[PDB]
Amino acid sequence: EVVAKLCAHVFCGSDNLQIVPGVRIPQPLLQQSEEEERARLTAILSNTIEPADSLSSWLQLPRESILDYERLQAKEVASSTEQLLQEM
């Protein structure tokens, strides 16, 4: 369902998608120039700036889940070091 809700978001779209919150991708034009379209897609990749909260902003999951992931891995590290000190 995660892959389904993502693919339903990335393909269906009419002239504007806005996959990342900053950039919108328009549909290809009538001129049918493939080199011009290649240059347009490369220019659209060059203009972008990766935000700091990209892990929570570009991916639609909330940032509290990110904080939960950091808390769990921090807990695993703190527990293993505490266990190693207690063993010696």
Swiss-Prot record:
The dynein complex consists of at least two heavy chains and a number of intermediate and light chains. Interacts with DYN3. Dynein heavy chains probably consist of an N-terminal stem (which binds cargo and interacts with other dynein components), and the head or motor domain. The motor contains six tandemly-linked AAA domains in the head, which form a ring. A stalk-like structure (formed by two of the coiled coil domains) protrudes between AAA 4 and AAA 5 and terminates in a microtubule-binding site. A seventh domain may also contribute to this ring; it is not clear whether the N-terminus or the C-terminus forms this extra domain. This is Dynein heavy chain, cytoplasmic. It comes from Saccharomyces cerevisiae (strain ATCC 204508 / S288c). Belongs to the dynein heavy chain family. The chain holds residues 4005 to 4092 of 4092 of the full protein. Present with 195 molecules/cell in log phase SD medium. It is found in: Cytoplasm, Cytoskeleton. Cytoplasmic dynein acts as a motor for the intracellular retrograde motility of vesicles and organelles along microtubules. Dynein has ATPase activity; the force-producing power stroke is thought to occur on release of ADP. Required to maintain uniform nuclear distribution in hyphae. May play an important role in the proper orientation of the mitotic spindle into the budding daughter cell yeast. Probably required for normal progression of the cell cycle.
